Design a protein around this ligand. Structure first.
Ligand SMILES: Nc1ncnc2c1ncn2[C@@H]1O[C@H](COP(=O)(O)OP(=O)(O)O)[C@@H](O)[C@H]1O
Ligand SMILES: Nc1ncnc2c1ncn2[C@@H]1O[C@H](COP(=O)(O)OP(=O)(O)O)[C@@H](O)[C@H]1O
Ligand SMILES: Nc1ncnc2c1ncn2[C@@H]1O[C@H](COP(=O)(O)OP(=O)(O)O)[C@@H](O)[C@H]1O
Lengths: 322, 288, 320, 282, 313, 288
């Protein structure tokens, strides 16, 4: 039950694509700005998350959750990150994909019960620490140990010594969790130490995983879909899309001409924003091989010829096969 | 009265069912509460628990609650009936955790005989409770078989089941039955039907919840919201309120104005629009 | 005796005392509770005389007919008249599916109970199975060797009873084979199935289609009997017999209106509105049930089909 | 004659099969008897058991009988072959030395039998196995028979079936009679044809004799006519229920009037389904 | 140590096949060493015999694709003949892998060991060294690699015939893909008479002959063609001679159309029972009368099921 | 140069991927080499193995090698990643040393922790290898989940995947994705497309394979042998040579002539004609 601020696991790769996101960048009465704290555009959704920030601070988020529906490449992990940033002072953030719960060497209930405990922290001459660390300091995980640490951690707050900072749990690809996983969450979201759960989905009316006749919105059950607050994200304009790319290049230390964003932006409009942003690094390295400081439009047209997006490459192989 | 609004049909029908419970003529039946989601199916079940007694046990477990890896389905259902029977008075599953500590099934049958003694003794006295199983079409023929064996018991509670499904495949087989219940049981059920709320009924409901969350509101913002409720869903309107005050009280208005309800309606969507936006994007992406 | 016989199942059949046949073998219009349904009643009369004359070696009986046409009632009738204190065991086919107990233990427990020994103490083979821990097949062969010996010693007589297996189309291919094997032995009771379904895929093969969901191995050992739906004039006669046995006073007109619900939904539904209708009359301080009441219950409570009619038909416009 | 009637084709074909049994040439084959339900497939198989010898073991297991929750399939089938081979069969000896069976107690008895047999003290004689509704078996069980037929002491296998092209249970392929093609290239197939009107009458005339029940000549042509219309199995059922009605009114012997009554009371699967498919659609 | 319980019952229908009847040139004589016709495929087997002797068959298999009853096993048996004297031949059908008392990997890995012999098969060295398990598999092979090193005894690999290849699931193919890599393997000769089939155990992947592409590439395919009534009579004439059955010249003509109507496997099967029916009437040989009768008494498989479905109507 | 022939597109893109490996920027990605069968997907992957190191480990496992009888999928996959991780003053190599019979998770963390000691010690050094998983659409969501838990590792090797299928239902799900890979992973892949070999490219390849069995050949032979190669498969035509020389050497010809190639082309078929003939016969008896 020792406190370990230093001992932690951080997925560098997951924060790295959102290193620039510093704050939801809302001001005044929650009014969004065209560009603030790294974010750009998405004014509608950015304003709304500003409200959810308030419901959390004012303790109104009683057993509620958040759902961010929208096409992929629209700033959904970014906003959920910013909400973790906006609650302030290094609140935990645990991004996980829905398809991680299907693992052979560990039960599904452990994979979720784990990711929750990584997202609730305790700032306790003081050092912060997550509930999962107090479990690993507590090689056996038991249902008895859970309530014990919940009493031990909550006896400290109830002593007034301890304050609980609950973080954000981001579950992407929510339509891949089966019923047994949602019913596990459904009781965990009832607890008083739980974090905020922020789901995310780009599918539509999805049948719940399993042989289920039920057709449900976003593949979530009806009983849990009632405690959800839905927020929509919209596709990025070519002009906005460029201003996103310009911010990643600045954060990587990559010098890129204007015409290279004008072209690199349009490929984003075609495939996704995630595809375009990935081409920066491989473009830069090819820019080094030809001994240039900055990425010329020749380098983007070149990388664009070598590497493919999944949505086209597979299209080729099926059709060339046919 | 007591938070009921409208629903006079089911409320009356529920009234009749108490009498067959009071007169001891309910043995070998059940009650099924059929109707659209969130039309007070829970409430009508909660009602009968209250009106039937001062200390009647009550349990609210869903269908999908049984498909968990915590224990068997039978253990989960057995624990339900055991909890919903009261014998101060404390339930039988309450007694099981004392005189046991899982539970050995021997412990159960052990406590059972001892309880038949104290009840027969005339020191201890038994009272049935109410079990409510929401979303009942999730259960399967292996769990329905358990209920018929469970209702046959002498100390059995009253079972009440809810559902929002018409003809459906009986989960666990290849046949279709009304409400996804086996036909051996549907001919013992008293089916009670709840109809969706009217316009005036809706307004009264929100006006009760606002009191519950101390939120001032204009008559225009009250009836603009009720309009939303009938157009989309009652559980949506009730969601917006707390989020609506926080915008109004942001600019320090305090009394919610129609502007805020027009605003917050534009920020958080309901499940209908959520899908249709996804569905539109899906098909235009499938386009070419 | 263990006194474990169920009563809440046969509660809806308290009035059925006999088959109500004359000496010749032609049915009377109503006697010993039964009403109409003469054709099946006469046929059961023949089945009664093959059981007594020991001609029912191996054969079973099937009562094929729509629901609420007296299938269970006719089965219960035969047992009482055939012998004094002859056991009747109703069971639905869907009872074999239980997790806490194997299918064989479900079928056998009912099979053994349907059989009783007249020593004088009458007791079912199953009481001797719980009288003689866990009851395995070794224990059953032993009792049958110690029971076939007692009767042969004159000390007791074996009275075989009735086993009614409703919803036969729900027993899988494994349960039947367990029955067929037992139905050939000598101590078994008379097995009476019942079905309201036509050709069905035999549960557990996903390709075989046989009548009523029974294998052809066993279907050639069944004597089929049909039952026809009850007329509006017979319908009103049955309900009056239940209203009496419940000690309920019903108005003559309301007995007509309750009969039409019989023709609309099923006979099992109309009979089940008696009790709740009576209590609604007690609320308004009446002795009998008047037409106001039956018109009141019939709008409060719903039969199964109409309810799902409402929800599913509301479900097309509810969602788009 | 074993009160055979008709089946002029299959009866002869069965006869030819006995010669390859007697000449020691049935090794690595089996007999399949295809034909409609109730055309003496068991009888024709019972016939060859008789004519082949006075003490030949005969075993009747149905195809679906293997699906037992009591024992696995292999015990179900192994116990069949062992059972089908003064004089006694292996499975009957298997229970004595196994005073379920221990796997070692079978191979034990086999070695002991190879001594007394080779000794010249005891003699082994193969019998006949009959597996009705063979299409019920699956590739997991068909594999067992081919391994089982390889033994020197193996019996002759006779399989019945009333199905054409059918999905081989356990796979996603369609084979004739639901038997794998590795096995159909070993089978001797015999086809049994449906009975005529005259053939039917003689059958029912015998079974009335079997149960001591008289009938008028009109009744036979009526009862035989019912036989051809619905099934011989049904008509044979009506008799015992017929006599009990004729004997009811103190008649001497069954008349057409009683075949009339016993007909409108008990039904066959054809009318029973139609008088219920009418309700099913409605 | 050897009871040699080899499938004689299985090869009994191939007693006449003595070899591939090859001529001095690549062409082989029209009729020799038992075989008749099917020349094109015969010549190819003549090439496969060389690549085995020249040790070029490393890793490769043979696939004999063609209609049923066109001489697949007979060639595969002949190939075992040409590769020297008394070389193992282990014909197995694909559906033998599905067994309750045995893992699939056993009965496959076992038939493979029955088919590689020494100067005594490697399967004999597991029953003789029995505790046959995978631990003991890796031991006697190296314990026998030593003997070839010493020249005490030489390894002759035989032939393995896996019929109905489309019945082996994806797990069995991956197993053979392993053991066909080792250096003690025999020549695996598959046989199939089906086109594209869903690979058993995948339910979505379609491949030629039901074989996975990873293994379908190390295979040399050889087609066989159906027999003419002309040639088909000669084969039936050959089986009668080897069974001591005197047959009328007219009957071979009526027994050659019944072949081309159904199969060659069927017509060869009607010989023995036809002969016994002639013994019934006390005849020396088979007259046309007999085959006119056995064709009436017994049925080929597909026609019998043809009748029952029409009787279903 | 260096045996590679054609594939000029993929050869260059493969070149860039080395740079993200050398510059330490491959972490959290992988390479998918999409392309029809027999277009040198293994070669281009093996080229990265050669071009990147003097001792770089390399493993070539198909997807279907995971569906094995004698181990779990986790076991089989885990042993792959262990083997493909180099170490010298591979991890799976040491595991038979510090263990002895099987390997356990506690045994692994032992050797892994001990290696964290000798690495930072300055005495032992670790270098990642290259894992090549051909036929990747065979894998399922239980195996893809393992990779995402694997590539996050500090000494994880570079993953290279091949495949020849477009949309597929992800084996293990009810969902379709391009290349049979989950969408959570495809947003982390660098895709390379390999094009089918041109005519001159094919001829050059055969000329190398012939040389390998010291099989000489006439010019018309190559021109004819290439035509079959472009017409059927590069993997087929290479099969004929070995068999072709044995016919030429059969008539002591000394050098393969078109008569042999026309001959052996007539004796050993290919998968295309093979099926067609089956499918022609497959229909006729089916017609009846
Ligand atoms: N409004 C934004 N401000 C800053 N970065 C953004 C914005 N929208 C998208 N991005 C960037 O685009 C990438 C995709 O993030 P996200 O859209 O959440 O993934 P997905 O679209 O699959 O949910 C990240 O680099 C994210 O920071
Ligand atoms: N012939 C009959 N005469 C009088 N009452 C009958 C008769 N048959 C059935 N009943 C009664 O009618 C009601 C419904 O019929 P029931 O036999 O239960 O239906 P099912 O046909 O499905 O078995 C019960 O109260 C039953 O006792
Ligand atoms: N070329 C041949 N010459 C003579 N007899 C042959 C020839 N090919 C096959 N046979 C015989 O014809 C029958 C056909 O068996 P075969 O077709 O090889 O097996 P399969 O049907 O599995 O392909 C066997 O009796 C075989 O010995």
């Amino acid at each position: 039950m020792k406190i370990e601020e230093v001992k932690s696991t951080t997925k560098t790769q997951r924060i790295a694509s959102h290193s620039h996101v510093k704050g939801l960048g809302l001001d005044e009465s929650g009014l969004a700005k065209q560009a603030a704290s790294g974010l750009v555009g998405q004014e509608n959704a950015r304003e709304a998350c500003g409200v959810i920030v308030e419901l959390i601070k004012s303790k109104k988020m009683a057993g509620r959750a958040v759902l961010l529906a929208g096409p992929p490449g629209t700033g959904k992990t970014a906003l959920a990150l910013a909400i973790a940033q906006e609650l302030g002072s290094k609140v935990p953030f645990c991004p996980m994909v829905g398809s991680e719960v299907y693992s052979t060497e560990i039960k599904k209930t452990e994979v979720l019960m784990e990711n929750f405990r990584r997202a609730i922290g305790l700032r306790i001459i003081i050092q912060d620490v997550t509930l999962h660390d107090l479990d690993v300091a507590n090689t056996e995980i038991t249902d008895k140990l859970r309530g014990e640490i919940n009493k031990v951690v909550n006896k400290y707050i109830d002593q007034g010594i301890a304050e609980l900072v609950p973080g954000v749990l981001f579950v992407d690809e929510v339509h891949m969790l089966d019923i047994e996983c949602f019913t596990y969450l459904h009781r965990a979201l009832e607890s008083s130490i739980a974090p905020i759960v922020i789901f995310a989905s780009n599918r539509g009316n999805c049948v719940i995983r399993g042989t289920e006749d039920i057709t449900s919105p976003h593949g979530i059950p009806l009983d849990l879909l009632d405690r959800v607050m839905i927020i929509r994200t919209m596709l990025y304009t070519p002009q906005e899309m460029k201003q996103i790319i310009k911010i990643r290049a600045q954060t990587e230390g990559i010098n890129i001409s204007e015409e290279a964003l004008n072209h690199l932006g349009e490929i984003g409009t075609k495939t996704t924003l995630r595809y375009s942003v990935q081409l920066l690094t491989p473009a830069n390295l090819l820019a080094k091989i030809n001994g240039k400081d900055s990425i010329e439009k020749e380098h983007v047209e070149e990388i664009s010829e070598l590497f493919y997006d999944a949505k086209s490459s597979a299209k080729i192989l099926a059709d060339q096969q046919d | 009265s007591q938070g009921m609004v409208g629903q006079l049909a089911a409320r009356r029908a529920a009234g009749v069912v108490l009498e067959m419970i009071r007169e001891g003529k309910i043995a070998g039946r059940a009650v099924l509460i059929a109707g659209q989601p969130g039309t007070g199916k829970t409430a009508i079940a909660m009602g009968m628990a209250q009106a039937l007694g001062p200390d009647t046990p009550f349990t609210a477990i869903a269908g999908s609650e049984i498909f968990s890896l915590e224990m068997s389905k039978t253990e989960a259902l057995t624990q339900a009936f055991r909890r919903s029977i009261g014998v101060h008075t404390v339930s039988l599953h309450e007694i099981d955790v004392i005189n046991s500590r899982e539970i050995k099934s021997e412990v159960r049958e052990q406590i059972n005989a001892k309880v038949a003694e104290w009840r027969e003794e005339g020191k201890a006295e038994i009272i049935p409770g109410v079990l409510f199983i929401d979303e009942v079409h999730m259960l399967d023929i292996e769990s329905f078989s358990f209920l018929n064996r469970a209702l046959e018991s002498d100390m059995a509670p009253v079972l009440i089941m809810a559902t929002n499904r018409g003809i459906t495949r009986i989960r666990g087989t290849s046949y279709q039955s009304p409400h996804g219940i086996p036909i051996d049981l549907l001919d013992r059920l008293l089916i009670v039907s709840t109809t969706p709320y009217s316009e005036k009924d809706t307004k009264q409901i929100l006006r009760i919840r606002c009191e519950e969350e101390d939120v001032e509101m204009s008559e225009d913002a009250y009836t603009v919201l009720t309009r939303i409720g009938l157009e989309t869903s009652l559980r949506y309107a009730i969601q917006l309120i707390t989020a609506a005050s926080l915008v109004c009280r942001k600019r320090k208005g305090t009394e919610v104005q129609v502007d805020d309800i027009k605003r917050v309606y534009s920020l958080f969507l309901d499940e209908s629009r959520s899908t249709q936006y996804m569905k539109e994007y899906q098909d235009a992406f499938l386009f070419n």
